[PDB]
Nucleic acid binder design. Sequence first.
DNA 1: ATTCCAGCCATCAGAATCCCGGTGCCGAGGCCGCTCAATTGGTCGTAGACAGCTCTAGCACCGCTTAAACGCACGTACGCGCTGTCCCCCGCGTTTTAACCGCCAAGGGGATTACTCCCTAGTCTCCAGGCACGTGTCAGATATATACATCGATAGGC
DNA 2: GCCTATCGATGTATATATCTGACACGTGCCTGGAGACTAGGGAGTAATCCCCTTGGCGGTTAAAACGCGGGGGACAGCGCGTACGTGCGTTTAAGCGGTGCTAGAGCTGTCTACGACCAATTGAGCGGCCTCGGCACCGGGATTCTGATGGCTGGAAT
Lengths: 663, 93, 95, 102, 97, 78, 86, 103, 105
Amino acid sequence: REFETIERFMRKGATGATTTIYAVEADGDPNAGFEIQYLIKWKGWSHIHNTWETEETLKQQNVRGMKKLDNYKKKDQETKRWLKNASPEDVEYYNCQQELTDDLHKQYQIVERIIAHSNQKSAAGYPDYYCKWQGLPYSECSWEDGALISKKFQACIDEYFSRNQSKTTPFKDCKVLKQRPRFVALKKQPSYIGGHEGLELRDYQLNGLNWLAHSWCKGNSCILADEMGLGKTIQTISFLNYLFHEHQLYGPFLLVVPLSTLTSWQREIQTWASQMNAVVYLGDINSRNMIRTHEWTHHQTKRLKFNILLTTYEILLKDKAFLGGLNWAFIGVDEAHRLKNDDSLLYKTLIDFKSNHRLLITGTPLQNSLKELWSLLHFIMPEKFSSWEDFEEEHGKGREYGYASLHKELEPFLLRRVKKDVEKSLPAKVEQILRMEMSALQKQYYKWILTRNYKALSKGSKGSTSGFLNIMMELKKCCNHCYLIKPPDNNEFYNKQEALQHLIRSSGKLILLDKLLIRLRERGNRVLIFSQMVRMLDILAEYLKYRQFPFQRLDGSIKGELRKQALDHFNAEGSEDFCFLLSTRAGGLGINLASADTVVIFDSDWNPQNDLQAQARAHRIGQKKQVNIYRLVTKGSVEEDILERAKKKMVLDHLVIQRMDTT
Amino acid sequence: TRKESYAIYVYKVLKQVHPDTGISSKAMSIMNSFVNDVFERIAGEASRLAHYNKRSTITSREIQTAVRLLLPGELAKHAVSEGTKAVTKYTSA
Amino acid sequence: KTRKESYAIYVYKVLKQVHPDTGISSKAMSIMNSFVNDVFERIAGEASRLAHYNKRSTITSREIQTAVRLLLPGELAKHAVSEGTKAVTKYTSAK
Amino acid sequence: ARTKQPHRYRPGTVALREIRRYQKSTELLIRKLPFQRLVREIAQDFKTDLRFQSSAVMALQEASEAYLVALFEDTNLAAIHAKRVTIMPKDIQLARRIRGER
Amino acid sequence: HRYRPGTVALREIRRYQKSTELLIRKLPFQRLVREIAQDFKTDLRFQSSAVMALQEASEAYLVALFEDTNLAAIHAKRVTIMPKDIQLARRIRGERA
Amino acid sequence: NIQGITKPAIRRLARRGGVKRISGLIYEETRGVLKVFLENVIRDAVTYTEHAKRKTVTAMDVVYALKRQGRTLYGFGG
Amino acid sequence: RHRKVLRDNIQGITKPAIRRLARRGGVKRISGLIYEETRGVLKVFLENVIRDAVTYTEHAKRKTVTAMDVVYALKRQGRTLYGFGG
Amino acid sequence: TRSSRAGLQFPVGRVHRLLRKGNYAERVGAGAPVYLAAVLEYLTAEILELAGNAARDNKKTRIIPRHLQLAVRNDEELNKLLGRVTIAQGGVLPNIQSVLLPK
Amino acid sequence: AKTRSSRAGLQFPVGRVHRLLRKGNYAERVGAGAPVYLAAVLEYLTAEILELAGNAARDNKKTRIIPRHLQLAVRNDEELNKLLGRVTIAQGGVLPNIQSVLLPK
DNA sequence: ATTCCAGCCATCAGAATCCCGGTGCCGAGGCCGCTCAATTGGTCGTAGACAGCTCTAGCACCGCTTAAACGCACGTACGCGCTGTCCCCCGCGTTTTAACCGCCAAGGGGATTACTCCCTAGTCTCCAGGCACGTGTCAGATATATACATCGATAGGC
DNA sequence: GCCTATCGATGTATATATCTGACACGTGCCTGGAGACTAGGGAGTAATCCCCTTGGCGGTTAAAACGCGGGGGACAGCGCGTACGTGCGTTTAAGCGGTGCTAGAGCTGTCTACGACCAATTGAGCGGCCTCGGCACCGGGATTCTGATGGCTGGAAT
Ligand SMILES: Nc1ncnc2c1ncn2[C@@H]1O[C@H](COP(=O)(O)OP(=O)(O)O)[C@@H](O)[C@H]1O
Ligand code: BEF
């Protein structure tokens, strides 16, 4: 059938080069007489050029980008008008915010690590050096004058050269992998640990290090489940350092640290284990390319230069290819309970990573089912636990002897030391549950939700009736605060002092919370608020801004770089921040705060282990004072219903766990 | 439980026309939907023909007329030829 | 001559109930009969397809209701549904 | 010693490239999640507390994209008819009216 | 006396839109229908109602096509219909695509 | 025979459509489109007639053919 | 700071999305008023389809809209879709 | 009889017979034909009322296809129901585009 | 053989078509030849579509028929385009076509 | 100081529907009788209505990356108004061809009816197409490669 | 105001080498299709007869058909100006991974109500007639455009 350009917008005479770090050292401030301007910022040049400049200097050089000044003018006018009307308390909050922000900005000027050096020996003795930025990703790396960097940052060039000349970097072939050496008992802390500062590991840490070493000599991987607050990471880095020195093993190591805890690990690997080079493999694609170019391979030998990496799960997943061939011996994982669901892509990714020793670090590995514990055990040695059905039949529930069998088999693979058995100095935790009655507005919204009479809630609100497809999550919102379901009408009250009263009376919980916070304020105790609803944090922040001192915040939207500063400011001695707003899943895990005496759980997670994790953020090694924990519960509401499940689960878990001790 | 479809028969047709070629699952679903649609269309036209002529039965002739009404030109002619051949071979048994 | 059924006697009663002093010619009547036939056929086809899709062997009143809602515009659909419900209620009353 | 002591395509070149690219690619163009949001919002007006199977939204998106593409083709023909190159709302209106959409 | 171009056109528009009679001569249409059918089967007979139905359908189709053509013409800011208008109308309708 | 559809007839049909001015080329196009429509309808009409084993094309055949083509006609039966 | 404002869901069919759909249709130049018109047309189409889909769902005593409901709704409008059932 | 019980002028028995001898479903419910008859009667009543109104507007007293066409095309809902339907002798709705009218 | 498709020499299921017609409420009776005829028609249409789909696939250097290939085959054939004129094939896209008036001379 | 086009109204011939009365057809709408199809009453057996139960799979977050959306700047291409020329159509008169109507005649095909017998639906027993589920591993998704057609658009040939 | 020529650089395309998930075959079993057999209604005829389609013909207007002039639209070429495209830096939110729950989508199974299929029987609706009014006709009636004479002046021009 071409001229420079402005980057951003932040006495008379002080301008130009003389104000730069080349001359301010010799002449300081050219004038400091009795108008005002803001810090220099140019597109294309490093921040280390900080100076004080005037409106005319840009014009004189004909810098392209003057038209950009209009937005800055808008900002200036808005700030001027807004600040005057701001209440004195809000003014204080804003001033503290500015004070912290300028310090954040300045921190960039401090160079952390020289990355590369140019063959052009300027002045025949000053090669150009590629300088890293403190608190900024590798994407911002720029070359700087060798002499200039030496004047203010001499030591860093010595660091980079010494590391470059070093030969401790790992090698592809190792005889240790073929046959493990004989175990040697560590009777006392080696002198090289802690450095000249003489830092001493606590005894239980030394015992755990001995246990981990013994397990390594047998070739068996292990799970470390030390009770939260005992410093698991210190023991991990101690094992790494032991592998370094007492075995001459400088093999690749890969610690998958969460994002919130990355900086803590980095600081501790710099203080401890200073003999090892660390690479924080975080940032955008370009920054990772920069690392993979400069800090990855020793081009003169094609050998690996790094010792310990610091990656997150989300980044490791998105670059799983590159590491797949560069097999690492010591693939460590922190906050390992993410591996409790073997189907999760992290499990399938890491299980294909050829590793010789994997150590999981999780405070509460027991979790809600034996399957999760089996999953972790499988991650230890896939050969010995390759079958689920066999394990299930071998450990049939109900019979009492099976639990003792479990506690026997776990002992060589899982190590855990309760606080009371290793450090009695720590004050005992105080747990109190404060019932509270729902407010009348809460009761009316609750009645409407239960009847699903959307007609009432819709009055003057954009809420969608289809958003009620999960009544549990809306009942929880109603219980917490009315504003979550129905945004408050800002036109009802123009005076803040009245809107604050309405906000307080709107939520029954706040009626107790404000009084509790004031009473703790009298004692001078700092308070940590953990909540699993991020909008709840917004509500609480708005409430705080009216009355109390500046507060730091930690939720998943806060970029990592700022979390370092927030944590340091709250922890730093002399801090005035009254309380810390921490989202549970983001900030409740791992971070070592140890600077507060109250931990208030606004809303309870479906999983009590997360709540226990949050409580332990304060109750850590650094606490010199007892911590009082208050769990908020709304009487006559589903929140108690959740707590009943929590009680059953907790009783069962405690009964099982207590069998581990020979009491 | 069991859902019945034309997957295997379309696959046989494919391995007759293009032995090497394969067929993705969504392509197979598309072909199944097309077969169902043409089936229902021809059946409906045949039913209308029967009701109009006050018949009570659908015969090969009704299907032939439905094909002539639905498919255009050469497609209809070839479909009619194939149907006549199939019926003849069936009777020849 | 064999018998050709039609709705003439019914359309005429409806006309004499909405407009007593009015009449209808032989072609307007044919148009009305065709319209009735077309609406019947489309509603019946909707009911049949609804039944087959839902794997059911009966054309219930509810099938006709959904068919009318699918086919007629909003206001016509609402009025037709109301009248059908009333008719069904009255029919079931004399049980 | 640093011490401190362009190309531009013309209007229409990229449009043709986009035309070719999106005629070649079959990938869905509207972002899935906002379309799901709009589908749910519209459905709310008919029956509250409705649930949607994941394939229902996909089918609706495919049908809507195909309908919009056909409408844009007709609109482009209408614009060319007026000896123009820009599609304007009256072009869509004419296309719909001819197609018979009220 | 002599009307300006356009007046009689609107007069005819009003005359024919108001009325209902068939516009095409019946006998030429009968001949066209018979000729078209001849290619399919010889000796065919047509009921008068069949021819009238075909005429009604054809007139309705042509009137609708002319309305669409008029809309297309106005789109180009013209007032006179020309073939490309019919072609555009058909293509948009899907008849010729 | 197609010429039997004369210029005045197409003129009148255009008038009913609201056309005020008609180009001289519209007539051939109208004749062609009419021929195509007639062919499409008549083929189905004959097909229906042939199935019935008849020789006279009835009005019902035309009605069925139009209903297939989406041109439902009321006035003769259905 | 954020003023708690939220954009309309209809505005979620962004200007680049209409631009891309136009590109697939062969459109070289797009007037700025097309976008609102396109949004309205899409809303009307979705309303027409979803009405029939919801009716079908209600008939089955179901509270979930299934792909077959959408297929049937589109088939009613003469817009048969393939690849999701039949 | 089965129509007086429903108060419908249309025939329920004929609708039942057509539903059964129509190849629509294996069996047909008792209530289906009454519903269908009521719907058809309502539609006919609406069309006839509009047609009679149109006839009054023309001073005639006998409905003819012109009247039905006018009624259908002047009602948006009825026009949408019968969009693809052409009525013999119905003519067209008087509609002259503005651009064609004189200044 | 014991299978009605072998007798007719078709691949499509003649008995399944007979079941569908018999259960679809299309008519009160179904002849023996109607299933065979309909099965043959369906088989021919499937073969016609698949030939073009495979040709399009081989043009793109592919080996599996995807919806794009089916759409290309359907839209590039005048007859199949009329039969499937109102059919939207998911994930099939559209035929490449740029109006002349848009490209420069 | 003076004035002719557009222009508000103008005012008066025609040229049109329309408005009206007559006249008078014929198709409505009413009545009659009688068929057959709808109604009443009965048994009868399965849809399907309801209940109880298992898990998909659908919803609601948080968290975090990172690509796409967004806002703004620049300039140039297209739109839309405008003017002017030309030809193409409209309107009208007069001639020519053919519809249209009425009465008539034929016989061909639709319609109908009696009678027959063959093919289909309904029931039963008995497997082997068919499908769910599992699985091993090539085709395609995906990195990194250069190779190849030009936004122009700049510089020199007239 | 033009031809060609190279890279302000740019984005497709056409090559590899992974690796990875979807897809092409295998295997158990249980439903559904296929061999038997039967009953009986519907389809298939051959007759008959009635209508209504086809074809003739003569007169008889209506329409179609040309032919001409001149008005006003079509359509081209020109000229502003603005809104659209392109491109960049910044932001937003989609997308995806992980964690919870549980509403509700499908199934099984029980047994009961309500349709199907009968039989008598009876009245609604059908075809067949029959006889006036609604609506054609068709005037001359009125009157409602409508285009060319018109009066004037403002405005730009004299
Ligand atoms: N060996 C040690 N000696 C003294 N203090 C220690 C030691 N190990 C840990 N710490 C304290 O623990 C804090 C770090 O907590 P860390 O154990 O890193 O948290 P994580 O639970 O994430 O491991 C530090 O502030 C430090 O003061
Ligand atoms: F318990 Be640790 F701070 F993770």
